[PDB]
Amino acid sequence: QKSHKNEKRFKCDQCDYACRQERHMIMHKRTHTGEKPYACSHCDKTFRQKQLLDMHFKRYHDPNFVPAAFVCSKCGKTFTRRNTMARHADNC
DNA sequence: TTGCAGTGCCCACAGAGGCCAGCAGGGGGCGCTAGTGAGGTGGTTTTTATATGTTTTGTTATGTATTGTTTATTTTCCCTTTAATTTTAGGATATGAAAACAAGAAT
Ligand SMILES: [Zn+2]
Numbered sequence A: 001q002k003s004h005k006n007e008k009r010f011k012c013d014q015c016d017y018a019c020r021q022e023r024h025m026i027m028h029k030r031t032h033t034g035e036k037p038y039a040c041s042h043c044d045k046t047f048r049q050k051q052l053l054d055m056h057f058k059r060y061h062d063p064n065f066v067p068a069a070f071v072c073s074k075c076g077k078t079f080t081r082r083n084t085m086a087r088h089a090d091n092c
Numbered sequence B: 001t002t003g004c005a006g007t008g009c010c011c012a013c014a015g016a017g018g019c020c021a022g023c024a025g026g027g028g029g030c031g032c033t034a035g036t037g038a039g040g041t042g043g044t045t046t047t048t049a050t051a052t053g054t055t056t057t058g059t060t061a062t063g064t065a066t067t068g069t070t071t072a073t074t075t076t077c078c079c080t081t082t083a084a085t086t087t088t089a090g091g092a093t094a095t096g097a098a099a100a101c102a103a104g105a106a107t
């Protein structure tokens, strides 16, 4: 098992992607064989993956969405994604 | 910019295996003692053995009694010669008993 320890332990039958964890195999499988049994309580949307889209539910319906400012350096403009702040800060 | 498909990372509870005290297995070496077992020494008696005294046994000498021996005085058997003692005539006695005589008595 030291061969399999901290490696791509679980192969996928349909495609050659591999993940270390089983949970990843169940989520990966649902994309190939569409089950999407997770459903926002306020809209029609049916989600494949777990509570990240339950976070969809939360935010799409909660007026307390509160987008984290995440202010940069001197210019100070706000962006919703970390990679954007790092790239624009490198030359700001 | 988002949904979708696929990846990264952080945690955490399991899982795992070395760490550790606890504890039980077989075996080595000592502390100490009850209880015989045997061996050696001392005492006792005892038993054999030895020596002394008394008595019993064996041997020797003297006296008495028994058997034998040639005398030796009976003694006893056998002669020839007397000394009573007996037997046989031969004469004499005696005492009896007739016989004769004499004396009474009778006829
Ligand atoms: Zn696949």
Ligand SMILES: [Zn+2]
Residues within 6 Å of the ligand: A040, A041, A042, A043, A045, A056, A057, A060, A061
């Ligand atoms: Zn919704």
Ligand SMILES: [Zn+2]
Residues within 6 Å of the ligand: A072, A073, A074, A075, A076, A077, A088, A089, A092
């Ligand atoms: Zn800036």
